Amino acid sequence: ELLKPRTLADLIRILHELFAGDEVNVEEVQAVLEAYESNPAEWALYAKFDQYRYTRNLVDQGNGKFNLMILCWGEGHGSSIHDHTDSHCFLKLLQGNLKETLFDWPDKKSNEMIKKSERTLRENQCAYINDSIGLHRVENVSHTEPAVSLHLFSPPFDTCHAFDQRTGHKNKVTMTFHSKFGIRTP
Ligand SMILES: N[C@@H](CCS)C(=O)O
Numbered sequence: 001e002l003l004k005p006r007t008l009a010d011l012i013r014i015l016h017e018l019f020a021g022d023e024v025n026v027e028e029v030q031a032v033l034e035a036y037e038s039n040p041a042e043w044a045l046y047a048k049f050d051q052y053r054y055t056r057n058l059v060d061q062g063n064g065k066f067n068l069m070i071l072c073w074g075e076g077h078g079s080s081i082h083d084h085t086d087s088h089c090f091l092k093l094l095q096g097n098l099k100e101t102l103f104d105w106p107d108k109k110s111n112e113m114i115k116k117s118e119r120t121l122r123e124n125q126c127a128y129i130n131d132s133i134g135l136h137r138v139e140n141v142s143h144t145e146p147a148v149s150l151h152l153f154s155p156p157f158d159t160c161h162a163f164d165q166r167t168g169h170k171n172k173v174t175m176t177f178h179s180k181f182g183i184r185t186p
């Protein structure tokens, strides 16, 4: 029985319930993530920016089955084209806008990766992806507004691949946390 999260803290408790079992109900998780109305005061602690690239800020370690983090995107900051390591990825906008560009898994042959589609995620919207769906790139294309997003991954993962848009070639990346629980972690 899914209720509206009243606050970020509330959202986290609900996520522990949802992941209390071995199976994820994706539409339910996406629904509750969406239902949370972004309140900048609730997550300001986690919203730590870097001048040159986007940052990953851990919010909750989950119950072994997931974790939850906040990503902060300066003007013009974006990601690589990437996968999600056989895990669920949920992404919700907390501030600003992000452009999400979808790509298919590349064939063996070296080829331009052509955009399958793109969309603009606006404040409070929650997107979902997993490897069965495809790959994506996420970008703050604004010249004037920073962006902030909330990401839920299940199971947790700290590695993934980046794909070269010219060739489809992948490289394994290890991701780092800019902060954990509000604390900068160099
Ligand atoms: N999964 C990547 C990009 C956002 S979905 C990350 O953790 O930085």
Ligand SMILES: [Fe+3]
Residues within 6 Å of the ligand: 082, 083, 084, 089, 136, 138
């Ligand atoms: Fe992603």
